[PDB]
Amino acid sequence: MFKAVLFDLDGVITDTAEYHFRAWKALAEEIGINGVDRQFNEQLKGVSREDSLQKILDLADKKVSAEEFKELAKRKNDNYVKMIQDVSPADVYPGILQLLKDLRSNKIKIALASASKNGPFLLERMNLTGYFDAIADPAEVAASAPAPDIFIAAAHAVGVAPSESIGLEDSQAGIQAIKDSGALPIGVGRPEDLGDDIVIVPDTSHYTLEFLKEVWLQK
Ligand code: BEF
Ligand SMILES: [Mg+2]
Ligand code: NA
Protein backbone atom coordinates (compact mmCIF):
# COMPACT_ATOMS: atom_id res chain seq x y z
CA MET A 1 0.00 0.00 0.00
CA PHE A 2 1.20 3.56 -0.56
CA LYS A 3 2.93 5.03 2.45
CA ALA A 4 2.38 8.80 1.98
CA VAL A 5 0.14 11.37 0.32
CA LEU A 6 1.77 14.57 -0.95
CA PHE A 7 -0.80 17.37 -0.97
CA ASP A 8 -0.79 20.46 -3.09
CA LEU A 9 -2.70 23.21 -1.19
CA ASP A 10 -4.43 25.59 -3.59
CA GLY A 11 -7.13 23.73 -5.55
CA VAL A 12 -6.81 20.63 -3.35
CA ILE A 13 -7.14 21.58 0.31
CA THR A 14 -8.73 25.03 -0.24
CA ASP A 15 -9.07 27.80 -2.82
CA THR A 16 -6.95 30.96 -2.64
CA ALA A 17 -7.72 31.99 -6.23
CA GLU A 18 -10.41 34.54 -5.24
CA TYR A 19 -7.89 36.30 -3.00
CA HIS A 20 -5.24 36.40 -5.75
CA PHE A 21 -7.84 37.85 -8.15
CA ARG A 22 -9.02 40.49 -5.71
CA ALA A 23 -5.37 41.41 -4.87
CA TRP A 24 -4.56 41.99 -8.58
CA LYS A 25 -7.79 43.88 -9.20
CA ALA A 26 -7.07 46.17 -6.24
CA LEU A 27 -3.55 46.89 -7.50
CA ALA A 28 -4.83 47.58 -11.05
CA GLU A 29 -7.45 49.99 -9.68
CA GLU A 30 -4.79 51.75 -7.58
CA ILE A 31 -2.49 52.32 -10.59
CA GLY A 32 -5.33 53.12 -13.01
CA ILE A 33 -5.22 50.12 -15.34
CA ASN A 34 -8.59 49.05 -16.69
CA GLY A 35 -9.58 45.53 -17.69
CA VAL A 36 -8.53 43.36 -14.70
CA ASP A 37 -11.85 41.53 -14.48
CA ARG A 38 -12.72 37.90 -13.73
CA GLN A 39 -12.38 36.82 -17.37
CA PHE A 40 -8.98 38.49 -17.72
CA ASN A 41 -7.88 36.87 -14.44
CA GLU A 42 -8.17 33.44 -16.06
CA GLN A 43 -4.94 34.38 -17.93
CA LEU A 44 -3.17 34.72 -14.56
CA LYS A 45 -3.97 31.20 -13.27
CA GLY A 46 -0.80 29.05 -12.98
CA VAL A 47 1.32 32.05 -14.01
CA SER A 48 4.12 33.45 -11.85
CA ARG A 49 3.57 36.67 -9.87
CA GLU A 50 5.99 38.51 -12.18
CA ASP A 51 4.52 37.21 -15.41
CA SER A 52 1.02 38.06 -14.07
CA LEU A 53 2.07 41.61 -13.24
CA GLN A 54 3.52 41.93 -16.75
CA LYS A 55 0.21 40.82 -18.31
CA ILE A 56 -1.53 43.55 -16.30
CA LEU A 57 1.02 46.24 -17.31
CA ASP A 58 0.57 45.15 -20.92
CA LEU A 59 -3.17 46.02 -20.75
CA ALA A 60 -2.09 49.70 -20.66
CA ASP A 61 1.23 49.29 -22.52
CA LYS A 62 2.74 50.49 -19.22
CA LYS A 63 6.53 50.53 -18.94
CA VAL A 64 8.25 50.56 -15.54
CA SER A 65 11.76 50.29 -14.07
CA ALA A 66 12.93 47.08 -12.39
CA GLU A 67 12.53 48.83 -9.00
CA GLU A 68 9.00 49.99 -9.85
CA PHE A 69 8.16 46.44 -11.02
CA LYS A 70 9.43 44.89 -7.77
CA GLU A 71 7.40 47.41 -5.75
CA LEU A 72 4.16 46.69 -7.66
CA ALA A 73 4.63 42.93 -7.16
CA LYS A 74 5.25 43.57 -3.44
CA ARG A 75 2.06 45.66 -3.15
CA LYS A 76 0.01 42.85 -4.77
CA ASN A 77 1.54 40.35 -2.31
CA ASP A 78 0.75 42.69 0.62
CA ASN A 79 -2.85 42.82 -0.66
CA TYR A 80 -3.04 39.02 -0.89
CA VAL A 81 -1.58 38.48 2.63
CA LYS A 82 -4.15 40.91 4.07
CA MET A 83 -6.97 39.14 2.21
CA ILE A 84 -6.08 35.63 3.50
CA GLN A 85 -6.27 36.78 7.14
CA ASP A 86 -9.77 35.43 7.58
CA VAL A 87 -9.29 31.98 6.05
CA SER A 88 -10.98 29.48 8.40
CA PRO A 89 -11.79 25.78 8.80
CA ALA A 90 -15.01 26.40 6.84
CA ASP A 91 -12.80 26.98 3.77
CA VAL A 92 -11.45 23.41 3.68
CA TYR A 93 -12.70 21.69 0.57
CA PRO A 94 -15.21 18.82 0.84
CA GLY A 95 -13.79 15.44 1.76
CA ILE A 96 -10.32 16.71 2.64
CA LEU A 97 -10.56 16.71 6.44
CA GLN A 98 -12.01 13.17 6.43
CA LEU A 99 -9.23 12.05 4.08
CA LEU A 100 -6.60 13.52 6.45
CA LYS A 101 -8.23 11.74 9.39
CA ASP A 102 -8.40 8.44 7.51
CA LEU A 103 -4.79 8.67 6.32
CA ARG A 104 -3.63 9.40 9.89
CA SER A 105 -5.78 6.53 11.27
CA ASN A 106 -4.14 4.18 8.76
CA LYS A 107 -0.56 5.42 9.61
CA ILE A 108 -0.11 6.88 6.12
CA LYS A 109 2.24 9.85 6.09
CA ILE A 110 0.87 13.29 5.16
CA ALA A 111 3.10 15.97 3.61
CA LEU A 112 2.40 19.40 2.14
CA ALA A 113 3.90 19.76 -1.33
CA SER A 114 2.67 23.24 -2.19
CA ALA A 115 4.26 26.14 -4.00
CA SER A 116 2.58 28.49 -1.48
CA LYS A 117 4.94 30.49 0.73
CA ASN A 118 1.90 30.86 3.02
CA GLY A 119 1.32 27.09 3.43
CA PRO A 120 2.05 26.86 7.19
CA PHE A 121 -0.07 29.91 7.90
CA LEU A 122 -2.98 28.63 5.82
CA LEU A 123 -2.88 25.17 7.45
CA GLU A 124 -2.96 26.89 10.89
CA ARG A 125 -5.91 29.05 9.86
CA MET A 126 -7.76 25.91 8.68
CA ASN A 127 -6.85 23.97 11.90
CA LEU A 128 -5.06 21.31 9.80
CA THR A 129 -1.46 21.50 11.09
CA GLY A 130 -1.87 18.51 13.40
CA TYR A 131 -2.49 16.17 10.49
CA PHE A 132 0.72 17.06 8.65
CA ASP A 133 3.92 15.09 9.21
CA ALA A 134 5.92 17.57 7.15
CA ILE A 135 5.69 20.71 5.04
CA ALA A 136 8.13 20.96 2.16
CA ASP A 137 9.52 24.51 2.06
CA PRO A 138 9.04 26.02 -1.43
CA ALA A 139 11.81 28.54 -0.60
CA GLU A 140 14.36 25.66 -0.47
CA VAL A 141 13.73 24.09 -3.89
CA ALA A 142 15.88 25.00 -6.93
CA ALA A 143 12.99 24.78 -9.44
CA SER A 144 9.21 25.14 -9.40
CA ALA A 145 6.62 22.98 -11.26
CA PRO A 146 6.83 21.31 -13.68
CA ALA A 147 10.14 20.40 -11.98
CA PRO A 148 9.53 17.65 -9.40
CA ASP A 149 11.50 19.29 -6.59
CA ILE A 150 8.74 20.07 -4.06
CA PHE A 151 7.24 16.57 -4.37
CA ILE A 152 10.64 14.87 -3.90
CA ALA A 153 11.25 17.14 -0.91
CA ALA A 154 7.85 16.35 0.63
CA ALA A 155 8.26 12.58 0.25
CA HIS A 156 11.79 12.65 1.66
CA ALA A 157 10.70 14.83 4.61
CA VAL A 158 8.29 12.08 5.78
CA GLY A 159 10.90 9.34 5.24
CA VAL A 160 9.57 7.80 2.04
CA ALA A 161 10.60 7.51 -1.57
CA PRO A 162 8.30 9.31 -4.02
CA SER A 163 7.63 5.86 -5.53
CA GLU A 164 5.84 4.96 -2.26
CA SER A 165 3.57 8.04 -2.57
CA ILE A 166 0.47 9.51 -4.15
CA GLY A 167 0.48 13.19 -5.13
CA LEU A 168 -2.68 15.30 -5.40
CA GLU A 169 -2.72 18.35 -7.72
CA ASP A 170 -5.11 20.61 -9.64
CA SER A 171 -2.59 22.01 -12.17
CA GLN A 172 -1.03 20.60 -15.33
CA ALA A 173 2.50 21.60 -14.30
CA GLY A 174 1.88 20.09 -10.89
CA ILE A 175 0.78 16.80 -12.40
CA GLN A 176 3.95 16.76 -14.49
CA ALA A 177 5.98 17.48 -11.31
CA ILE A 178 4.37 14.53 -9.55
CA LYS A 179 4.95 12.21 -12.50
CA ASP A 180 8.62 13.22 -12.71
CA SER A 181 9.11 12.82 -8.95
CA GLY A 182 8.14 9.12 -9.20
CA ALA A 183 4.96 9.47 -7.15
CA LEU A 184 1.53 8.49 -8.51
CA PRO A 185 -0.55 11.54 -9.52
CA ILE A 186 -4.29 11.83 -9.03
CA GLY A 187 -5.53 15.08 -10.46
CA VAL A 188 -8.63 17.12 -9.65
CA GLY A 189 -10.09 18.94 -12.69
CA ARG A 190 -10.48 17.88 -16.28
CA PRO A 191 -8.21 16.05 -18.77
CA GLU A 192 -8.19 18.97 -21.21
CA ASP A 193 -6.11 20.79 -18.60
CA LEU A 194 -4.34 17.94 -16.78
CA GLY A 195 -3.81 15.27 -19.48
CA ASP A 196 -5.56 11.97 -20.20
CA ASP A 197 -2.74 9.64 -19.04
CA ILE A 198 -3.46 10.02 -15.29
CA VAL A 199 -6.45 9.37 -13.05
CA ILE A 200 -8.49 12.54 -12.58
CA VAL A 201 -11.47 13.22 -10.27
CA PRO A 202 -14.01 16.00 -10.95
CA ASP A 203 -13.81 17.50 -7.42
CA THR A 204 -12.19 16.84 -4.04
CA SER A 205 -15.20 14.92 -2.62
CA HIS A 206 -13.81 12.03 -4.68
CA TYR A 207 -10.49 12.04 -2.83
CA THR A 208 -11.32 9.31 -0.31
CA LEU A 209 -8.99 6.76 1.22
CA GLU A 210 -10.98 3.99 -0.45
CA PHE A 211 -10.54 5.65 -3.88
CA LEU A 212 -6.81 6.24 -3.38
CA LYS A 213 -6.42 2.57 -2.43
CA GLU A 214 -8.35 1.51 -5.54
CA VAL A 215 -6.13 3.66 -7.78
CA TRP A 216 -2.97 2.35 -6.09
CA LEU A 217 -3.97 -1.32 -6.50
CA GLN A 218 -4.91 -0.77 -10.20
CA LYS A 219 -1.35 0.58 -10.67
F1 BEF B 1 -0.70 24.97 -3.30
BE1 BEF B 1 -0.41 24.40 -4.76
F2 BEF B 1 1.01 24.89 -5.19
F3 BEF B 1 -1.51 24.96 -5.72
MG1 LIG C 1 -2.81 23.92 -6.81
NA1 NA D 1 3.60 17.21 12.66
What is the strand and helix layout of this fold?
Elements: E1 4-7, H1 17-31, H2 38-41, H3 49-58, H4 66-83, H5 96-105, E2 109-112, H6 119-125, E3 134-135, H7 149-157, E4 165-169, H8 172-181, E5 184-188, H9 191-194, E6 199-201, H10 209-218
Parallel strand pairs: 1-2, 1-4, 2-3, 4-5, 5-6
The structure holds beryllium trifluoride ion (BEF), magnesium ion and sodium ion.
Main location: cytoplasm
Active site: 8, 10
Catalytic activity: beta-D-glucose 1-phosphate = beta-D-glucose 6-phosphate
Short structural description:
Keywords: Carbohydrate metabolism, Cytoplasm, Isomerase, Magnesium, Metal-binding, Phosphoprotein. With 219 residues, this protein is α/β, with parallel strands linked by helices.
